[PDB]
Amino acid sequence: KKFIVVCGNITVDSVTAFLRNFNTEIVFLGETPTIFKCYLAYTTFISGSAMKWEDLRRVAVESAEACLIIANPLCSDSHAEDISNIMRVLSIKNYDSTTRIIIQILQSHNKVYLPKIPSWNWDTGDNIICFAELKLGFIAQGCLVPGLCTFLTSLFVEQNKKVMPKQTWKKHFLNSMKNKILTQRLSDDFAGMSFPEVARLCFLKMHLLLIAIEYFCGLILNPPPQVRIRKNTLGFFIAETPKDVRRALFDQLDSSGMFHWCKPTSLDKVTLKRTGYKFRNHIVACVFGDAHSAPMGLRNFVMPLRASNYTRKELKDIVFIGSLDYLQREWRFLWNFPQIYILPGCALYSGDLHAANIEQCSMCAVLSPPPQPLVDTEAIMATLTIGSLQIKVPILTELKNPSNIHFIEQLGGLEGSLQETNLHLSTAFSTGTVFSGSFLDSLLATAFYNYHVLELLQMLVTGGVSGRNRCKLGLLSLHETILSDVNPRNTFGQLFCGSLDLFGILCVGLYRIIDEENKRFVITRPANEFKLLPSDLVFCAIPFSTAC
Amino acid sequence: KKFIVVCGNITVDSVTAFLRNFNTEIVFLGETPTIFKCYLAYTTFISGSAMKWEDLRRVAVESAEACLIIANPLCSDSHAEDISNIMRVLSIKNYDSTTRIIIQILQSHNKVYLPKIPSWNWDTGDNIICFAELKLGFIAQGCLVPGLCTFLTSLFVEQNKKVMPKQTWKKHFLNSMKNKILTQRLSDDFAGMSFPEVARLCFLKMHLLLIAIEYFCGLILNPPPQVRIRKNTLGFFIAETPKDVRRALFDQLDSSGMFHWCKPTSLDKVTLKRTGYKFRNHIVACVFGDAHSAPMGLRNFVMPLRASNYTRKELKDIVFIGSLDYLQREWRFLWNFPQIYILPGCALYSGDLHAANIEQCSMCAVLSPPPQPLVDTEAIMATLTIGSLQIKVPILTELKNPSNIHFIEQLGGLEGSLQETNLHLSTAFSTGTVFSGSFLDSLLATAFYNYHVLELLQMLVTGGVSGRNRCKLGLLSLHETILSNTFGQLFCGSLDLFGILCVGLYRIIDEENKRFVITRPANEFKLLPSDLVFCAIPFSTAC
């Protein structure tokens, strides 16, 4: 009865990249013509074009629950692929303008067009995914707030829960990973209550950590007092299973005011000279490329580090180390961001790392290059030279293939038996010195089944989708910080409550030292009654302009 | 029982390039799959990947004596090959971190990473070879000290000893080549003796010329008085056979203080203008390339000519003549060396040679370009135009294929019968106007069987591996020099008076004043007044 159509690809990978990553029947459509015949009881296929009207009727899109548009047969021109796919959205909508569409855009700035189609509207369910935009987002956040990256990831990662842990601290880490982001609409008897009033009851009565809500037209993280809940309001939670969540059913900016802006200055000024100095508490991003390399959307990485709810005062400088020839091709889209600088060179060269004052930086991001026809070698070689420096430097390495974790740990020092084949079980992931977007492959199915989850994810990771006034996610010390005035700081739940109903700060996770170099690990949503240490730091939603 | 594994190549050449260049069993491993089946009684093969853990157990590296990593299937990207191979070293060490590893790096600056691996340590035997680094080293030394290049080579060359010589002087040259660098640990009754004290006894009692030692943590050439020998100390000698050596068992620098340094100045300043002058006693290096040419590690050639134990005063200017497009690609790695200059042009053009004041230079190095898919023609054509100049210019030509010697001698003047098919027998080699790294092919086996030999070679050739204070190798006159009857007589005085370790002669050929290299002559070897002498001059000596 119910089915979905798939468009614009014949990639053996994509079929599994979808089918494995995906009750509801599937049907394909595309240019190439039937080797993968094993998986062909749970699906159907067609050889046509999405443009041709006859072919769309042939598959009967009208009654299809939704229609996905898949991209990147490692296209020659990324730009052309999107234009091409955006062309399909027109063709498809022209057929049955009420059909739900989920299009993959390869490079973010090409999303802009999709709304400009009249036939398209968000409310019926139409949606766009950009992995480039999200994979770079997670990393960004990790550069803003130590650990925040892995925190965010664990809400979407799903441990298989077979691994019996050795040590107490690793026992904590894994069971915290059980936390997801479930969605649920709130009871009627809530109506009229202020957010913090509601947040409390769910936490205390139901042991549910609720963190944002929708009206569905407007999503907001940790609403202030003035905003009251309405009837039929959708809430955003953090919890193990959906059963548990169901219990709760009973200064200079841009035009849009979303990020700091400036008059588009040319690269010549921004490009650092190497012949003939100092930076402090800044972010070094290493990128790899050349004239022949595909573009990585660097906009997506600056933008979150340039949100409007930060302040010119507290913004960080961003030095890119890389091929100027590669980086000048991105510059068009990085024009209007401030305090961005480019050092031409290579991160593998420790001389060029010192030129960028990598010793006095705040975080070093090692950005994998995008794919071409030896997969993470570069990222591993950087982490080698950086990690072993005559100066440990803060670091965040991206892996395209997470199985390569055992190489990074090897460089750390821990021997083969103590090395993990699985990134998520790794100690390097729990600290947050690595990241791997592999898990976002399932995302296309997620945005189908519950797109609100994507909505939230999008804004946490990217910092936008009133304006300047919004909650950051931040890490707080408990020592010489405002929290240190809470009367009972003895237990997480105790801390959570005071902080909220005193300062409107929504405590959401901890960052605990490992006690067995002062490396800490991420605990998402601990038990209400969770013994807290004085050394702990705390992940939390800090509202804009708070003294701290 | 004992065996070694080989990695990262399926090159018919490499199999012979190793097998011919190599008691101990061999086993291969690589991507391509069995034509070379004749050589297959003394070896074994596999078709796998060194990365995959299953494949490493399959070959059983744990019990392997050591594991070599071979490079350069004339790769498209040289950089990528090393990164790739360095990736194997990780994979392999991850398996059995105690396994001995011998990796070939294609371009020197990529060695840096290998130590940064924790699992890797030198003491268990782990080691890296860089032919580019060594082949350019020998040449460098030849530019520092006339003849030094061939001297150094003969210690590693092995004559086949079939050639009955015509003339007295050629009789000397060939039998001096018998000298190798053997290694041996010293007797216990030596402990506490100062180096020069020890050097003496070995020379006089045993007729063994000893030249450096290790403790094994620290290698030193011609140690001063203050350094005494310890028990279980390893010595470095010069001698025919290991039996003989067994008898002895009974100013502005860089960060590391190894070479002169300076703030990285851009190419625009350093690049000589051709339109619109003078250099003196300088080194002209001719290089060949283009956008399409593979890189030759020019760092390796400057670095030794820029050692810290020389002094800003006595450093030589280095003019490169070549394609700017080619040379600007190397410039990143030559930044921090001083008195380096680049004349864009071609060495085949005698106009561009005169622009570089080649007439008033001290030595002209003709550097062969690295290999691509007519092998030494360029090197030969340069040597033609240089050697025939309206001005003979000092010259040192590199040959990738030594059989091409007979062309160079032809240009000299000597006719076909007097021409030699074999470079080492040639008169041009004994004078030191040519060089050929062909002999370093065996080096991978050498670094296996005795790596200390490589250690020494590395520092003699490259000038490094306390800091600023070390012995050069130098040529001294005997007339208006501090040295002013028999080699052994000269050897002893010079040492026990000035701490100068005399190691070889440079004798005129008497039958144009061209001289030939005599390594470690007999103790009682009649010396001429005209002779010059190779020797280890300690730093800051008056002379």
Q: Which helix (H) or strand (E) holds A44?
A: strand A43-44
- Angle between helical axes of B131-144 and B451-462 (0-180°, round to 10): 50
- Cα dihedral value A365, A369, A374, A375, nearest 10: 80
DSSP string, A355-396: HTTGGG-SEEEEEPPPP----SHHHHHHHHHHHS------EE
Q: What 3-state class would DSSP assign to B395?
A: strand
CB of A177 closer than 8 Å to CB of A157: yes
The residue type found at A4 is I
β-bridge partners, A513:
A520
Question: What are the structural domain ranges in chain A?
Answer: 1-548
**Min CA distance, A349 vs chain B (Å)?**
9
Chain B residues whose C-beta is within 8 A of a chain A C-beta are 80, 83-84, 86-87, 90, 93-95, 97, 112-113, 116-119, 263-266
**Min CA distance, B95 vs chain A (Å)?**
7
CB-CB neighbours of A133 under 10 Å? 24
A415 φ/ψ angles, rounded to the nearest 5 degrees: -75, 170
Report the distance separating Cα A364 and Cα A97, nearest Å: 46
Nearest by CB to A381, from B83, B93, B118: name it. B83
Report the distance separating Cα A37 and Cα A41, nearest Å: 8
Report the distance separating Cα B38 and Cα B167, nearest Å: 43
Dihedral sign, Cα of residue A101, residue A102, residue A107, residue A108 = positive
Chain A residues whose C-beta is within 8 A of a chain B C-beta are 274-276, 350, 374, 377-378, 380-381, 384-385, 387-388, 406-407, 410-413, 415-416, 419
DSSP string, B417-445: TT--SSGGGSHHHHHTSEE-GGGGGTHHH
Q: What 3-state class would DSSP assign to B43?
A: strand
Q: What 3-state class would DSSP assign to B262?
A: coil
Q: What 3-state class would DSSP assign to A483?
A: helix
Indicate left, alpha or beta for B227 from its phi (over 0: left) and psi (-120 to 50: alpha). beta
Q: Are A381 and B112 an interchain contact pair (Cβ–Cβ within 8 Å)?
A: no
Nearest by CB to A384, from B93, B116, B119: name it. B116
Closest CA to A31 of A42, A45, A44: A45
CB of B6 closer than 8 Å to CB of B18: yes
State the alpha helices, DSSP H only, in B280-439: 299-302, 324-334, 350-355, 377-387, 405-412, 427-431
Count of CB contacts below 8 A, A vs B? Answer: 48
The residue type found at B59 is V
- Cα dihedral value A429, A431, A435, A436, nearest 10: 20
State the alpha helices, DSSP H only, in A271-323: 299-302
Q: What 3-state class would DSSP assign to A265?
A: coil
Listing from the earlier edge strand, what are the strands of the sheet with B25-27? B43-44, B25-27, B3-7, B66-69, B101-104, B127-129
CB of B348 closer than 8 Å to CB of B382: yes
Nearest by CB to B116, from A377, A385, A415: name it. A385
Report the distance separating Cα A460 and Cα A151, nearest Å: 11
CB of B206 closer than 8 Å to CB of B146: no
Closest CA to A483 of A502, A458, A469, A456: A502
The residue whose two tokens read 């034509």 is B35
Report the distance separating Cα A513 and Cα A52, nearest Å: 60
Instruction: Show the tokens assigned to A456.
Output: 């939230």
CB-CB neighbours of B101 under 10 Å? 23
CB of A158 closer than 8 Å to CB of A214: no
The residue type found at A380 is I
CB of B512 closer than 8 Å to CB of B484: no
The residue whose two tokens read 């629950």 is A65
CA distances to B218, B220, B480, B506 from B459, rounded to whole Å, are 12, 9, 30, 22
Q: What 3-state class would DSSP assign to A497?
A: helix
Strands B363-366 and B395-398: parallel
CB of A230 closer than 8 Å to CB of A527: no
CA distances to A91, A373, B119 from A379, rounded to whole Å, are 41, 18, 19
Report residue A284 CA to chain centroid gap.
19
Residue to substitute from B56, B75, B88, B94, interface A, most A β-carbons within 10 A = B94
Residue A417 exposed, middle or buried by CB count within 10 Å (0-12, 13-18, 19+): exposed
CA distances to B111, B157, B488 from B199, rounded to whole Å, are 34, 25, 12
Nearest by CB to A275, from B86, B87, B266: name it. B266
Report the distance separating Cα B515 and Cα B508, nearest Å: 4
The residue type found at B461 is V
CA distances to B385, B469, B495, B498 from B537, rounded to whole Å, are 36, 11, 10, 9
The residue whose two tokens read 């001063």 is B224
| Contacts with B87 from chain A: Cβ below 8 Å | 374, 377, 380
Instruction: Show the tokens assigned to A223.
Output: 């609403």
CB of B435 closer than 8 Å to CB of B149: yes
Strands A3-7 and A43-44: unpaired
CB of A105 closer than 8 Å to CB of A64: no
Instruction: Show the tokens assigned to B228.
Output: 């005494």
Report the distance separating Cα A512 and Cα A67, nearest Å: 44
CB of B179 closer than 8 Å to CB of B506: no
Residue A537: half-sphere exposure toward Cβ, Cα within 13 Å: 18
What's the Rg (C-alpha) of chain A? 24
List the single residue in A with minimal CA-CA distance to B81: A374
Q: Are B263 and A274 an interchain contact pair (Cβ–Cβ within 8 Å)?
A: no
CB of A337 closer than 8 Å to CB of A267: no
- Stated in angstroms to one decimal place, the resolution of this structure is 3.4
Nearest by CB to B94, from A274, A384, A416: name it. A416
B109 φ/ψ angles, rounded to the nearest 5 degrees: -55, -20
CB of B396 closer than 8 Å to CB of B435: yes
List the single residue in B with minimal CA-CA distance to A386: B116
Instruction: Show the tokens assigned to A50.
Output: 């999405």
Q: Which helix (H) or strand (E) holds A69?
A: strand A66-69
Q: Which helix (H) or strand (E) holds A127?
A: strand A127-129
**Min CA distance, B315 vs chain A (Å)?**
23
Q: Are A410 and B116 an interchain contact pair (Cβ–Cβ within 8 Å)?
A: no
- Cα dihedral value A518, A519, A520, A522, nearest 10: 180
Report the distance separating Cα B57 and Cα B1, nearest Å: 17
Report residue A380 CA to chain centroid gap.
22
The residue type found at B535 is C
Q: Are B113 and A381 an interchain contact pair (Cβ–Cβ within 8 Å)?
A: yes
CB of B337 closer than 8 Å to CB of B302: yes
Report the distance separating Cα A192 and Cα A197, nearest Å: 10
Nearest by CB to A377, from B84, B116, B264: name it. B84
